[PDB]
Design a protein around this nucleic acid. Structure first.
Lengths: 125, 207, 103, 201, 64, 86
RNA sequence: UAAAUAGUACCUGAAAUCGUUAAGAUGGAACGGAUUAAGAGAGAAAACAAGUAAAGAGGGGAAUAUUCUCUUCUUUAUUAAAAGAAACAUCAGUGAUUAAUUUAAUUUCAAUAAAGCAAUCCCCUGAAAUUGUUUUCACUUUCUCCCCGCACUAAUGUGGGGAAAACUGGCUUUAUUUCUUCAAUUAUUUUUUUUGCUGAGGAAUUUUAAAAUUAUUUGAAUUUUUCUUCUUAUAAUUUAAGUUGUUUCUAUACAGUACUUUCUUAACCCACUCGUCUUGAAAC
RNA sequence: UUGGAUAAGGUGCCUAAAUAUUCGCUCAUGAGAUCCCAUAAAAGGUGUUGGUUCAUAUGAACUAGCCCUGAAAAUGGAUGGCGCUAAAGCGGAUUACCGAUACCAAGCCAUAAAAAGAAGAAAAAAUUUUUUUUUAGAAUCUUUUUAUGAGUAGAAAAUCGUGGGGU
RNA sequence: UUUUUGUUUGCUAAUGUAAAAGAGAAAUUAUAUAUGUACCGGUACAUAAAUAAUCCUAUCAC
């Protein structure tokens, strides 16, 4: 069903799974459109693995923003934080996975004094 | 102040505008563009001297007497504390079922209706509201259960705004005490509680 | 004696339904003493509480309620459709609901 | 529908109509107990219904009749099977609805001492024109192989005697209570009297 | 809009233009349902298609 | 322009008068005509109905003649059948 | 040895497959879709509290190694506010419901109280003597009477045969429609009870203009006026110009029994192995 | 997606909605029960119902509704099942209701088309002064509007990833 | 068998509801009639014939 928090409405949860991936190990759950001929899912038989459509698209006014109602931006050092100084209340910052504890403390403190929220603030400590 | 489009006389009441939304291009602005709103308007069967049944509070099923329409939709009610134990309570109409019997239809109660009104014109919604500093002080002691319950009771007692409501409650109850009590069956009616026996049907019985 | 009632008893039937198809947005509710559409119309707009017990405490209490509203009648025999904030679980079919005198 | 359980007297009730009403009640989560199931009536001649049951009896799985349709002969079991056929018994909810039903022949120990209800929408006197043939489920079961009809009749006449004694005692108690009321009604205050007789009490 | 109503109710000199300017009406199903879309209105049995004459108004009112 | 709510052009009085500049006058006239008392019609119903005696006479005669024609046709077809039977 | 779960098959060490422990399910498949519910895991980045004063640790910048200023963290008490959700109310849009209503048209009727007419007779209706016209009898109620069966009936009555007026029914006059009726259908108008769902947008030179309403004001018109209409000006409102307000709770918390989320189980409804050739595949 | 209202078809239970209302017919010791559709005929009946035409309330002859005979197959068996006869059958009639991914109103995604476009302060909270949000201008772009959306074989566009190379 | 407190190394305190909110109700029977009583199936008399459209049970604290 639809999920609605604040103004952000997510039109569908529980991401689509590939047909028959439940009962075949070689078939990964990642969605693939089934070509088939008599394919059930392709023909849209009721009660079987509905396919993604453009109609599920979230509205463009609130498309990419996180539950904190702002867009995420992934940074790798303190230098890539400069553009956030202007839109600190529209963007949250996430530190890249391959950033060391050297630099993570620096990015955390810089974002703190920049007044921009950090997503994975308590990582690697 | 009012407007009567199509002969209606909807009656307008000033309304504040406090919701603030960021406007499209540059600034922010107050969302509401209106200064007046048409007022509550109540059921035809809501009179001052009428007896209703509290329906949702901790006094569910209790009988009470309408006291005043508080010009905010909500109405003040007193199930006179001296006979019923129901204090001066501000409740709204849709959580009440009003019966068809006026307390002032009795010949010995009708005399003191003027004094009832002259005791009741001085209650208002701000008196019923809970003031911020006593709310803070009540929440302070939340950081053994009987002690905190008694503390909450006593701070509510020493609230200055509660005191005037209690005074009005006391004087109106003393005014209505003997005259109500000398009608035995009605006194028991007020003292009783309204249940819903399985013999009676809601859509058939009348209020 | 104690524990006044001041509500009407109802029973949760299935969802709003056709043969071979369900619309679990409306729940069919039967009233204790209503058997006609005219009588069922009397309760339209009233709040209905589905009160049920849980195995363990959730807010210091073992009981929780799902709220809903009597939207309109259903059929000719005094069954109503009710819309709840969250869909009634089909565990509850045949269970008891309070249909309260308020509003 | 809203009671803890409904005890219904199946005497003089048409089988299919009774089963339909019972099945709807069970599906709505109402526990019912059907008593005197051997006095259920069926439209159509006794011979015709016997022929129908013989056709049912001729029906078994060729490979292994143990698995076949268990035929059953007690009228209570026949009513139970009719209700089951009128019910989605292969689902969990349908199974619960089926198990919420109890069927008896005669009136046993708990149910002979509680009020028995009747479904007027399934009474033979109201649903069958008087000039058309009907059958008695007890006699049909006896012809099919139940061989417990007469014993149920004996138990029924015994229950009739004890019920008659209870009824006479109850009638005496009600008469004496009414006599108490008509006199104690003069001792209450006159305005209470007026209210009582105004509303017919 | 009153001129449009006049030109439509009476087949006035400006009727083709008003009708063409007017988007085709998108009506909801009848409030009490149809009789039988399969059969004629003039058939003795219940039916719906054909010329209803003045009886189209009651149908429009519940289709509107 | 940005799309707003399409106001009901029949019940929303402001939009109805905006669409139909004559509507408020027509409605006011209808309300005035409605606001007439009952004594006038009570004392004039007999006056309005007694003048309809000639209308009732005229409408009676047409239906009378139609029934006469129907009966005459019935009689003539019955006579034809009686003549043919022999 | 830094490391042996790097021990010679020795980097990493996936899947199939198997073991241990824990949790759950288990009536001739299992898995699944859609919707929730119950549990169990995790979680604070919106899912309350900016600032303020004090004291402790720090970091910077500017000012000519000494002053000012900016801050981060910790503790104290010290105040806001905001956000969501519920309830109620208002408005608007879209429906369901129950009471109506103006004016007309259509053979409507039906009563009230005083007269009168006809008596198988009347409003009717029926059957008979290049179209109309006219004539005849035959049409009703009786808790009325007479004769026969004289109790015979379904009957507290009855069958057959005759008389009677005239309550009943019909018609004609006069007054009334609140004793009673004034219907129904259609056209043409005006409202009303109780209620479901929804609230897009956020307008720096059109959320203006007007339209409506209110309060004054100008003249006119007319259905003749406590919603009469049309303008003359002014000032406000919204019924214009897509939802706003109040109160509570979350909560005076920093992660729980609540809230978000994953997973596992149920339950109602639904769901046949895919790929392929084929007109046609779940295909024996 | 949210509401509303329907189509086809249904409303005894399975199964949401009528054991609805109103008028007839039918008793079947193999009743009957929705187009396609899941078989039935000639010939009969002193079963019952209604009509037509002849003969002094009888005798006949026709006629056509339902019912019956005609009517026999192999695992056990199918109006879909239960069952149903004051129908839950057959033929009507009158209402109400249930019922779609169709229709209507509203929101949102995308597609297509369109209207248009290369600079200035708004609010709130504290107390005149501070504080907090924004204060926009990317032409395959921005704002707004309307309509529309199945799809094998096939075609195209925009996207998402991988090894390696310049920047 | 009764009372109080609770069930907020794999374990060694401990909880589940298909349905509480007055979940109230024992004569039998016939359906072109029944039931009670009194006499000897019969007679006589009562009763019942919208039967649950009923009756009974709740609030008067201390």
């Amino acid at each position: 069903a639809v999920k609605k928090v604040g103004k952000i409405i997510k039109k569908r949860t529980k991401k689509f799974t590939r047909f028959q991936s439940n009962r075949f190990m070689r078939v990964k759950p990642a969605w693939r459109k089934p070509r088939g001929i008599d394919c059930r899912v392709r023909r849209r038989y009721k009660g079987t693995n509905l396919m993604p459509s453009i109609g599920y698209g979230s509205n463009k006014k609130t498309k990419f923003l996180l539950p904190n109602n702002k867009y995420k931006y992934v940074v790798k050092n303190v230098k890539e934080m400069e553009p956030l100084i202007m839109n600190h209340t529209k963007y949250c910052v996430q530190i890249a996975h391959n950033v060391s504890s050297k630099k993570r403390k620096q990015i955390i403190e810089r974002a703190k004094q920049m007044n921009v929220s950090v997503i994975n603030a308590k990582a690697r400590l | 102040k009012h407007y009567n489009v199509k002969g209606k006389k909807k009656v307008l009441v000033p309304v504040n505008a406090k919701k603030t939304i960021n406007k499209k291009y540059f600034g922010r602005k107050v969302a509401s563009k209106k200064k007046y709103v048409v007022q509550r308007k109540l059921r035809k069967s809501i009179e001052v001297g009428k007896v209703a049944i509290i329906l949702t509070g901790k006094h569910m099923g209790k009988r009470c007497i309408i006291t005043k329409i508080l010009n905010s939709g909500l109405l003040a009610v007193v199930g006179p504390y001296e006979i019923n134990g129901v204090p001066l309570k501000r409740v709204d109409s849709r959580y009440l079922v009003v019966t068809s019997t006026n307390i002032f239809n009795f010949e010995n109660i009708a005399k003191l209706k003027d004094d009832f009104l002259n005791y009741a014109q001085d209650i208002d919604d701000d008196s019923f509201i809970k003031t911020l500093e006593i709310k803070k002080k009540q929440k302070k002691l939340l950081k053994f259960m009987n002690n905190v319950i008694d503390k909450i009771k006593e701070i509510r007692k020493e609230d200055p705004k509660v005191q005037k409501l209690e005074g009005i409650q006391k004087d109106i109850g003393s005014l209505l005490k003997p005259e109500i009590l000398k009608n035995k069956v009605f006194a028991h009616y007020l003292k009783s509680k309204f249940t819903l026996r399985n013999d009676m049907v809601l859509h058939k019985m009348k209020f | 004696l104690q524990a006044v009632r001041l509500y009407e008893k109802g029973v949760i039937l299935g969802y709003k339904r056709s043969q071979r198809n369900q619309d679990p947005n409306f729940t069919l509710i039967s009233i204790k003493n209503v058997n006609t559409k005219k009588h069922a119309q009397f309760y339209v707009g009233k709040r209905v509480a589905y009160v049920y017990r849980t195995t363990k405490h959730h807010d210091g209490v073992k009981i929780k309620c799902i709220w809903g509203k009597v939207c309109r009648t259903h059929g000719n025999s005094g069954v109503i459709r009710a819309k709840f904030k969250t869909h009634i679980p089909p565990k509850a079919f045949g269970d008891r609901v309070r249909i309260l005198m308020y509003p | 529908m809203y009671k803890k359980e409904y005890v219904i007297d199946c005497k003089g009730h048409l089988l299919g109509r009774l089963a339909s009403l019972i099945a709807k009640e069970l599906l709505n989560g109402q526990r019912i107990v059907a008593v005197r199931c051997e006095d259920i009536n069926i439209s159509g001649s006794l011979y015709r219904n016997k022929l129908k049951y013989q056709e049912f009896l001729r029906l078994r799985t060729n490979t292994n009749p143990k698995k076949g349709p268990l035929h059953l002969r007690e009228p209570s079991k026949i009513l139970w099977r009719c209700v089951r056929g009128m019910l989605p018994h292969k689902t969990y909810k349908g199974q619960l609805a089926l198990k919420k039903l109890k069927v008896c022949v005669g009136m046993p120990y708990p149910y002979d001492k509680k009020k028995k209800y009747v479904l007027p929408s399934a009474l033979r006197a109201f649903r069958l024109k008087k000039h058309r043939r009907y059958c008695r489920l007890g006699t049909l079961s006896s012809r099919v192989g139940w061989n417990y009809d007469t014993l149920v009749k004996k138990n029924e006449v015994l229950r009739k005697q004890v019920s008659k004694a209870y009824y006479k005692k109850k009638v005496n108690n009600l008469n004496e209570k009414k006599e108490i009321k008509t006199e104690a009604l003069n001792l209450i205050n006159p305005e209470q009297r007026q209210v009582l007789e105004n509303f017919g009490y | 809009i009153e001129d449009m109503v006049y030109q439509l109710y009476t087949c006035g000199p400006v009727f083709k233009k008003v009708n063409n300017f007017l988007w085709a009406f998108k009506l909801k199903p009848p409030r009490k349902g149809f009789k039988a879309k399969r059969h004629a209105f003039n058939e003795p049995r219940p039916g719906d298609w054909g010329n209803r004459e003045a009886h189209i108004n009651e149908l429009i009112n519940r289709m509107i | 322009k940005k799309r707003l709510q399409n106001k009901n052009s029949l019940t929303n009085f402001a939009v109805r008068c905006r669409l139909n500049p004559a509507y408020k006058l027509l409605r006011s006239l209808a309300v005035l005509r409605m606001r007439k008392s009952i004594l006038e019609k009570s004392k004039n119903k007999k006056e309005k109905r007694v003048q309809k005696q000639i209308q009732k006479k005229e409408l009676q005669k047409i239906n009378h003649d139609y029934y006469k024609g129907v009966a005459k046709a019935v009689k003539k077809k019955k006579k034809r059948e009686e003549k043919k039977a022999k």
